[PDB]
Design a protein around this nucleic acid. Structure first.
Ligand SMILES: [Mg+2]
Ligand SMILES: [Mg+2]
Ligand SMILES: [Mg+2]
Ligand SMILES: [Mg+2]
Ligand SMILES: [Mg+2]
Ligand SMILES: [Mg+2]
Ligand SMILES: [Mg+2]
Ligand SMILES: [Mg+2]
Ligand SMILES: [Mg+2]
Ligand SMILES: [Mg+2]
Ligand SMILES: [Mg+2]
Ligand SMILES: [Mg+2]
Ligand SMILES: [Mg+2]
Ligand SMILES: [Mg+2]
Ligand SMILES: [Mg+2]
Ligand SMILES: [Mg+2]
Ligand SMILES: [Mg+2]
Ligand SMILES: [Mg+2]
Ligand SMILES: [Mg+2]
Ligand SMILES: [Mg+2]
Ligand SMILES: [Mg+2]
Ligand SMILES: [Mg+2]
Ligand SMILES: [Mg+2]
Ligand SMILES: [Mg+2]
Ligand SMILES: [Mg+2]
Ligand SMILES: [Mg+2]
Ligand SMILES: [Mg+2]
Ligand SMILES: [Mg+2]
Ligand SMILES: [Mg+2]
Ligand SMILES: [Mg+2]
Ligand SMILES: [Mg+2]
Ligand SMILES: [Mg+2]
Ligand SMILES: [Mg+2]
Ligand SMILES: [Mg+2]
Ligand SMILES: [Mg+2]
Ligand SMILES: [Mg+2]
Ligand SMILES: [Mg+2]
Ligand SMILES: [Mg+2]
Ligand SMILES: [Mg+2]
Ligand SMILES: [Mg+2]
Ligand SMILES: [Mg+2]
Ligand SMILES: [Mg+2]
Ligand SMILES: [Mg+2]
Ligand SMILES: [Mg+2]
Ligand SMILES: [Mg+2]
Ligand SMILES: [Mg+2]
Ligand SMILES: [Mg+2]
Ligand SMILES: [Mg+2]
Ligand SMILES: [Mg+2]
Ligand SMILES: [Mg+2]
Ligand SMILES: [Mg+2]
Ligand SMILES: [Mg+2]
Ligand SMILES: [Mg+2]
Ligand SMILES: [Mg+2]
Ligand SMILES: [Mg+2]
Ligand SMILES: [Mg+2]
Ligand SMILES: [Mg+2]
Ligand SMILES: [Mg+2]
Ligand SMILES: [Mg+2]
Ligand SMILES: [Mg+2]
Ligand SMILES: [Mg+2]
Ligand SMILES: [Mg+2]
Ligand SMILES: [Mg+2]
Ligand SMILES: [Mg+2]
Ligand SMILES: [Mg+2]
Ligand SMILES: [Mg+2]
Ligand SMILES: [Mg+2]
Ligand SMILES: [Mg+2]
Ligand SMILES: [Mg+2]
Ligand SMILES: [Mg+2]
Ligand SMILES: [Mg+2]
Ligand SMILES: [Mg+2]
Ligand SMILES: [Mg+2]
Ligand SMILES: [Mg+2]
Ligand SMILES: [Mg+2]
Ligand SMILES: [Mg+2]
Ligand SMILES: [Mg+2]
Ligand SMILES: [Mg+2]
Ligand SMILES: [Mg+2]
Ligand SMILES: [Mg+2]
Ligand SMILES: [Mg+2]
Ligand SMILES: [Mg+2]
Ligand SMILES: [Mg+2]
Ligand SMILES: [Mg+2]
Ligand SMILES: [Mg+2]
Ligand SMILES: [Mg+2]
Ligand SMILES: [Mg+2]
Ligand SMILES: [Mg+2]
Ligand SMILES: [Mg+2]
Ligand SMILES: [Mg+2]
Ligand SMILES: [Mg+2]
Ligand SMILES: [Mg+2]
Ligand SMILES: [Mg+2]
Ligand SMILES: [Mg+2]
Ligand SMILES: [Mg+2]
Ligand SMILES: [Mg+2]
Ligand SMILES: [Mg+2]
Ligand SMILES: [Mg+2]
Ligand SMILES: [Mg+2]
Ligand SMILES: [Mg+2]
Ligand SMILES: [Mg+2]
Ligand SMILES: [Mg+2]
Ligand SMILES: [Mg+2]
Ligand SMILES: [Mg+2]
Ligand SMILES: [Mg+2]
Ligand SMILES: [Mg+2]
Ligand SMILES: [Mg+2]
Ligand SMILES: [Mg+2]
Ligand SMILES: [Mg+2]
Ligand SMILES: [Mg+2]
Ligand SMILES: [Mg+2]
Ligand SMILES: [Mg+2]
Ligand SMILES: [Mg+2]
Ligand SMILES: [Mg+2]
Ligand SMILES: [Mg+2]
Ligand SMILES: [Mg+2]
Lengths: 260, 209, 134
RNA sequence: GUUGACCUCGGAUCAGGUAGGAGGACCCGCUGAACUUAAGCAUAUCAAUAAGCGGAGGAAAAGAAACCAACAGGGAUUGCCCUAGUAACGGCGAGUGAAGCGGCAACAGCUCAAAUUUGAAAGCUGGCUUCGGCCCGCGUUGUAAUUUGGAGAGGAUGCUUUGGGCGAGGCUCCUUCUGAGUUCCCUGGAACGGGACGCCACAGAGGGUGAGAGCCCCGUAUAGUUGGAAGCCAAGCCUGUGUAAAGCUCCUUCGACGAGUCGAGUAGUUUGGGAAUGCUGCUCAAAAUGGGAGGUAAAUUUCUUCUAAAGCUAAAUACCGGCCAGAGACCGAUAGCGCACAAGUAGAGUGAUCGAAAGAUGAAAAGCACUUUGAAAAGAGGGUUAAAUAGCACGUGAAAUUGUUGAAAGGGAAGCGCUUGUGACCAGACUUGCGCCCGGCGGAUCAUCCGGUGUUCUCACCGGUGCACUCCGCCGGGCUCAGGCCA
RNA sequence: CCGGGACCGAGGACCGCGCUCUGCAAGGAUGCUGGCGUAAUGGUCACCAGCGACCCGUCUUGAAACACGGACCAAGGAGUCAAGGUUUUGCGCGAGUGUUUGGGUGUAAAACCCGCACGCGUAAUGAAAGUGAACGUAGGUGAGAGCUUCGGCGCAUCAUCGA
RNA sequence: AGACUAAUCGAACCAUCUAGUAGCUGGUUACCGCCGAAGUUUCCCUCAGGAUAGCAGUGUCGACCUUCAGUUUUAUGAGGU
RNA sequence: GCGUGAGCCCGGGUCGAACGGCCUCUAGUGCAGAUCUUGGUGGUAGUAGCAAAUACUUCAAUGAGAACUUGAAGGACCGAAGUGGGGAAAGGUUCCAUGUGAACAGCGGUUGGACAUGGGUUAGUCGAUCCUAAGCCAUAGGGAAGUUCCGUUUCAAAGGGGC
RNA sequence: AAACUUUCAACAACGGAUCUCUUGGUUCUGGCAUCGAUGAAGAACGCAGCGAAAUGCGAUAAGUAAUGUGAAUUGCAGAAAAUCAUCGAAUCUUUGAACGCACAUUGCGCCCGCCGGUAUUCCGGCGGGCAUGCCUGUUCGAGCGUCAU
């Protein structure tokens, strides 16, 4: 509150009364009289530098950088080691860029949670869904008083084409814990890299996979970035003939014997 | 107290600025409210477009002289030339501006053609369905794909003139005789010296008597 | 997950409403399930408990005890069951407060009002089932 | 001559009405500081702010140009972005500081004075009235119709225009109704915990229930539905009718347009407004293509742009003051509002005013019957509870400080560092593990071969074979190797 | 050249210098033996003993000060936030760059998408009217990393003479 | 008598402006590692304070160029203690 | 037990419902001081002290308990400008009866202006009420932006008697 | 050697820190526009079977009517719903802008009507009225201000 700690008429007593020069509540007949009133070190006083609403709560991010981050997260989602390192259960997933026929989700095919659950189990997201189900815990903080009562892991993210698949699949997948859906044309970085960690497990539909290229071609002012390296296999580069044939002979070994 | 090589500070915070800080945490909520109001007014104007027809207008100053935009309303002369009565124009979605004038045939003709296209595309339902008049759409061409946004369907087609154009050689115009730079210098000098030359000429003319 | 703007998921508000609800709202709050036989008979799952109902306790230290509801202390959100009692130091017998959600109704006190209730619930449930089965 | 008019001015507890106060977060005005900054201080700044006064609403205010401009011209008001920390102001110091254009949100236009209805005050308040009208009064010192500069008035001219009633159907509103375990086992006082087996999910938001409950209960999702009131919109229908009124196309002519007002001087204040931006006081005091403005004072000559001195008007904008509602990377009883509680309370002051402290037994009072000692408070037994060292001085229960018990030291402080000693009390390490021979027991693969799969394509696995001078394991004996502490 | 004593044993296959060369005292300790295998070693605490040891914080040239504050304990308690500026990090795009005033859209304060204008930059200079940037392969000289066909080509940058 | 004006008088009390300003006093909260000062110059109504240069840290970059030096030697000037 | 250290981990006891590690994000994030704030608690310390107003004593009753309860007796003081009997202001139930654990009566307490439960204030003649005083507030008017100021009979058409 | 002081430990005190909790704050966002002479806000005094306060209410007083729900309230007692929700009908003490004049007084008046005491006049009981500024209208008036007979 703007007026917290200031709703008093306290004045300092000055020196010469053997008390500190802090402002003191005037009057009598109550415990409050004669007590320090205004400083940050005083009980019932004003906090130091009271928090203001005009703090910079939001962060402006370049749209180009947002689109790079989204593209990088999408690329990381296609790497199986990254999914496991992010904690997804993908040992039974048939293929890392997991694509399910849009005929299995289109219209009212998975409009019911039972049907959606059966489809996820069939395609191999069942272990991840069960991991989310079993991970539910009570929060350790004071967020229990503030509405964040339970914590749980993230599950598969279902990406679909709303133009071709409809939106009944959203209702079908809504109630399964840890499973969230996103239209292919509105991909969210907060979901593609939860907590800033890359490798979200994604279940695509065939229509969404078909539409992804057009989605990225329709972005005005953005082109997919060119990497600063061409070959990421450092072992291949270093142990290729082109490099190894011009090196000088090694001047030592991994271990050096002690001479003196 | 400056201490190094600093730009001289001039932050106007010597009043009690905190008393008048305007944050904007209500930006998304206000956008939602605006969208709701737009939807409600569009529903109220059920078959009509949500806006009025506006004329093409040239921005005033020597800056922005090159660009056109939408104006407030059509002039009385433009309405008369298009054949739309003054009292009938605002009741069929046409904005009327009584204080704008048509100083140029180009603007007059452009706005008249705009009004004529709008009138050609207008579908006028009868006041009473059971007795349509001769000025209303006769119930057969009353079904068509309509537009609800005149600002988009009747926008400024090209605010600026085309910046690129190709002409064949030997059609290249001959330059100003003394050159463009000299011509500008001469025009400037004449504008500067118009008054002095005038007074000198009249003085020399009257010197005889 | 809640969607409707009129619904609030505030723990503080929910607790305040529950613990300051008026008597008529506390009546609905203190509902109890019907037995399997009554549920099959009436096509009704739960009903607000009433004095004179016959219940069986299915939770707590007094499980399997049956008896008639002798009082519905809304102010304390409890019911009193016949012969489900305790002894003070003086040996005087006092009833033990049982939450209605910890009991099942084995026999209902039925009068037209208590029944218009059951008919409304049955008709609503049957209609909802039919509409979902369309 | 008196009465009778009308002109002013009065009476009445005459008939009917209206205003005050509250609220004042936001809004419209008036009035109006100083602290402060200038490293002093007076102009300046704080600030056209605080305090004081008057007046409204859900918004207020502003508002349809006596505008901006100088362009190829824009076109009521308001607000956001930008213009722009710019033009400018300023002991030209400190510091201050707009506007036009441009993009957007929202868009809405209008009515009076100034004219003769003059072939008919055609207008209005009040009372009575069957509803047709009547009467009084207001009003000609002007109430209606027409007209508002975008014009209009007057004429031509031929076209064109209009009033009422339903109304399916839809959107609202109130109301009835909503899926699934309390199945088995263990812990527990109590499962809402763990394990097993199931179910619902457009509902796995939230809360309660004796501990972390989608399926025990309230609720939660979804469009539906039961009954009802009738609030809105509305496709389309039904039906009057041109005396009257209304628009357009042309036109000689006419074409009313706001005065102690504009403007000027001076004074004060204010502004970025600078030979004077607005406002106000005083003095002077207009005109009719006149007048204002065109950011340098003046005369002269042009040009541009509007048309003051009368008035109304949604929206986009401010505001959490009031009434509701939803939320949070907020605080968590010295925090968060002064107030989580009979808090603006108790209490203080003559008064204006000042103004606290203070949440938690337990799932359930089951809040300790009874015996005994005591004058009593209480104690000791006993009882309740999962628990009483949870007993209304009640969850947990720190430190300061204190009592008892045990150990120790102490010839005018104590504490502390390095280093032994004594006494007390302790953590580790070890109590084996590797191999190799000689016996016993058990088993079936141990090599090889055949077939089938996999895979890193030559390396394995699985079956069939093997079948005891193999292989594996467990005991018993001997030997080897290493392995603790101090020397 | 012979003795007597003390402290220490870092490293962990070979590799090397070498010598008195079947080996060695030569690029860092091994061999043999004994007692015990537990409070024995060792740690902790209390006390005695030898030596040492002024009360902290602060201002100050100088504090143990006869300088000030501090009886004790628990909890609270002091470089924050916003705007503007600057330099240096890390990013994206790059002669451009900046979506989020606004609009569209949404699983609804999120995320996603859109563009006109505008800001900054792309040109300076003068008070202003105004004018406004190639003689050269965008110059010559000396350096200059790196390349080089080994003759010079010469980045950044510095000094210098010019346009 | 600068006396008295509610224990308050060389200008009462209450609330607010107000968290008034202070070149002045006091305080300013975990650890380790590396580097490491100044009380001097010029200007200031400057003398208990600032700016300015110096001393210090950090971050770099350049070919870290074959140069640099609180030093000696040699050769050659100046000085008035 | 680990770490140079801030600290981290474990054993035992108490206790009763939530909590932690890792990588990022975030801040109202680390106390011995500020004559710091609030609260609590010490030594001093069973210490200073409880000494103005002449003063108490005997027997009995009551009671667990009697110097400060009561009865009787004695001895004393106030000595009619009283320590007497009634009032004004002010207080508000302190008045009366009954009962009484704790707290208060700076010792005690059976007693009390304390605590608890019940009662108690009767007016034509006593006061208020009526009158006017100093004075205050209206009105008519006049000022003031206004809250309001003056005005009290003043530049006012301001009433009461009968048939 | 005790006592005393100090140190260390266990238990017991004192005190209320720590942990956990939260029908409370704080901040943001969304919807809405509704006080009063038809007497508001605020104040006082009263009202329950057993209440001091808080909450609610006004002599119809912990509330009445009406509608909805459908069996309680609860500390005890009592009885045949409810300390329920909703809320369109009422009641609404003394006050307060506060209005007969006053008020530091439960003070002092006047008018109309009714009912009693022999009563138009006095007394008593009851009910309804009596403020100011201003507007419109009504009626009664004033003025050689003025017009005709
Ligand atoms: Mg506080
Ligand atoms: Mg200030
Ligand atoms: Mg009247
Ligand atoms: Mg009146
Ligand atoms: Mg008012
Ligand atoms: Mg100053
Ligand atoms: Mg100063
Ligand atoms: Mg001064
Ligand atoms: Mg000012
Ligand atoms: Mg004010
Ligand atoms: Mg509005
Ligand atoms: Mg208005
Ligand atoms: Mg006009
Ligand atoms: Mg114009
Ligand atoms: Mg405009
Ligand atoms: Mg000026
Ligand atoms: Mg200013
Ligand atoms: Mg614009
Ligand atoms: Mg009438
Ligand atoms: Mg349900
Ligand atoms: Mg059990
Ligand atoms: Mg629970
Ligand atoms: Mg279980
Ligand atoms: Mg639950
Ligand atoms: Mg005019
Ligand atoms: Mg004037
Ligand atoms: Mg002027
Ligand atoms: Mg003037
Ligand atoms: Mg002046
Ligand atoms: Mg002024
Ligand atoms: Mg002026
Ligand atoms: Mg000019
Ligand atoms: Mg006007
Ligand atoms: Mg006007
Ligand atoms: Mg207006
Ligand atoms: Mg508090
Ligand atoms: Mg406390
Ligand atoms: Mg407080
Ligand atoms: Mg008081
Ligand atoms: Mg407690
Ligand atoms: Mg026990
Ligand atoms: Mg305990
Ligand atoms: Mg306990
Ligand atoms: Mg406790
Ligand atoms: Mg202690
Ligand atoms: Mg010593
Ligand atoms: Mg030792
Ligand atoms: Mg085999
Ligand atoms: Mg030892
Ligand atoms: Mg020692
Ligand atoms: Mg010494
Ligand atoms: Mg000194
Ligand atoms: Mg010192
Ligand atoms: Mg000394
Ligand atoms: Mg000193
Ligand atoms: Mg000092
Ligand atoms: Mg001291
Ligand atoms: Mg705390
Ligand atoms: Mg602390
Ligand atoms: Mg910054
Ligand atoms: Mg640009
Ligand atoms: Mg220029
Ligand atoms: Mg080179
Ligand atoms: Mg004197
Ligand atoms: Mg006083
Ligand atoms: Mg005095
Ligand atoms: Mg004074
Ligand atoms: Mg004061
Ligand atoms: Mg050093
Ligand atoms: Mg000077
Ligand atoms: Mg000093
Ligand atoms: Mg000499
Ligand atoms: Mg000399
Ligand atoms: Mg518990
Ligand atoms: Mg802090
Ligand atoms: Mg402390
Ligand atoms: Mg310190
Ligand atoms: Mg203290
Ligand atoms: Mg003390
Ligand atoms: Mg003594
Ligand atoms: Mg004494
Ligand atoms: Mg004595
Ligand atoms: Mg005495
Ligand atoms: Mg006795
Ligand atoms: Mg005595
Ligand atoms: Mg005497
Ligand atoms: Mg005597
Ligand atoms: Mg006398
Ligand atoms: Mg007496
Ligand atoms: Mg007396
Ligand atoms: Mg008196
Ligand atoms: Mg008495
Ligand atoms: Mg007694
Ligand atoms: Mg005593
Ligand atoms: Mg006593
Ligand atoms: Mg007593
Ligand atoms: Mg007694
Ligand atoms: Mg008493
Ligand atoms: Mg008398
Ligand atoms: Mg009287
Ligand atoms: Mg009188
Ligand atoms: Mg007066
Ligand atoms: Mg007056
Ligand atoms: Mg020690
Ligand atoms: Mg305690
Ligand atoms: Mg806590
Ligand atoms: Mg009333
Ligand atoms: Mg009255
Ligand atoms: Mg009245
Ligand atoms: Mg009196
Ligand atoms: Mg009388
Ligand atoms: Mg009579
Ligand atoms: Mg009478
Ligand atoms: Mg009366
Ligand atoms: Mg009358
Ligand atoms: Mg007369």
């Amino acid at each position: 509150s703007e007026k917290a700690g200031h709703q008093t008429s306290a004045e300092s007593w000055g020196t010469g009364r053997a008390v500190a020069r802090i402002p003191r509540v005037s009057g009598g007949g109550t415990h409050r009289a004669g007590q320090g009133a205004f400083g940050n070190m005083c009980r019932s006083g004003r906090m130091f530098a009271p928090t203001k609403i005009w703090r910079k709560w939001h962060v402006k991010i370049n749209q180009g950088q947002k689109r790079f981050a989204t593209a990088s997260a999408l690329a990381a989602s296609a790497v199986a080691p990254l999914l496991m390192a992010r904690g997804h259960q993908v040992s039974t997933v048939p293929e890392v860029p997991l694509v399910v026929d849009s005929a299995a989700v289109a219209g009212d095919a998975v409009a019911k949670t039972a049907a959606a659950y059966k489809l996820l189990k069939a395609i191999g997201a069942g272990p991840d869904v069960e991991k989310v189900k079993k991970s539910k815990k009570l929060r350790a903080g004071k967020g229990k008083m503030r509405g964040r009562r339970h914590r749980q892991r993230r599950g598969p993210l279902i990406v679909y084409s709303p133009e071709h698949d409809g939106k009944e699949l959203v209702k079908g997948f809504r109630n399964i814990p840890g499973v969230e859906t996103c239209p292919v044309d509105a991909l969210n970085l907060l979901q593609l890299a939860p907590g800033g960690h890359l490798g979200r497990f994604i279940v695509w539909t065939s229509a969404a996979i078909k539409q992804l290229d057009a989605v990225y071609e329709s972005k005005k002012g953005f082109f997919l970035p060119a990497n600063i390296v061409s070959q990421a296999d450092l072992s291949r580069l270093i142990n290729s003939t082109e490099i190894q044939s011009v090196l000088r002979a090694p001047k030592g070994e991994a271990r050096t014997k002690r001479a003196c | 107290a400056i201490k190094h090589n600093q730009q001289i500070p001039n932050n106007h915070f010597r009043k009690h600025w905190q008393r008048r800080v305007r944050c904007h945490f209500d930006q998304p909520g206000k956008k939602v409210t605006r969208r709701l109001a737009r939807r409600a007014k569009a529903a109220a104007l059920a078959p009509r477009p949500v806006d009025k027809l506006r004329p093409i207008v040239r921005c005033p100053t020597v800056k922005y002289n090159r660009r056109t935009r939408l104006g407030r309303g059509f002039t009385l002369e433009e309405l008369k030339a298009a054949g739309i009565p003054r009292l009938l124009a605002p009741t069929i979605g046409i904005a009327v501006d009584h204080r704008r004038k048509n100083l140029s045939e180009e603007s007059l003709a452009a706005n008249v053609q705009r009004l004529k296209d709008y009138k050609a595309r207008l579908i006028l339902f009868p006041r009473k369905s059971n007795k349509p008049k001769k000025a209303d759409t006769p119930k057969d061409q009353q079904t068509a794909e309509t537009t609800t946004s005149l600002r988009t369907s009747f926008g400024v087609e090209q605010p600026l003139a085309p910046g690129f154009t190709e002409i064949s050689k030997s059609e290249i115009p001959a330059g100003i005789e003394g050159g463009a730079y000299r011509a500008l210098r001469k025009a400037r000098s004449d504008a500067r010296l118009v008054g002095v030359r005038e007074k000198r000429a009249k003085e020399k003319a009257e010197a005889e008597a | 997950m809640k969607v409707r703007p009129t619904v609030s998921s505030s723990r503080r508000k929910a607790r305040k409403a529950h613990f300051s609800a008026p008597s008529s709202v506390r009546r609905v709050i203190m509902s109890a399930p019907l037995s399997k036989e009554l549920r099959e008979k009436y096509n009704v799952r739960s009903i607000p408990i009433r004095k004179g109902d016959e219940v069986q306790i299915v939770r707590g230290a007094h499980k399997d005890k049956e008896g008639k509801v002798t009082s519905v202390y809304r102010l304390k959100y409890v019911i009193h069951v016949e012969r489900v009692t305790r002894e003070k130091a003086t040996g005087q017998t006092v009833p033990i407060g049982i939450h209605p959600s910890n009991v099942v109704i084995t026999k209902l006190h039925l009068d037209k009002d208590r029944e218009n209730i059951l008919a409304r619930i049955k008709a609503g449930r049957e209609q909802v089932a039919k509409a979902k089965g369309k």
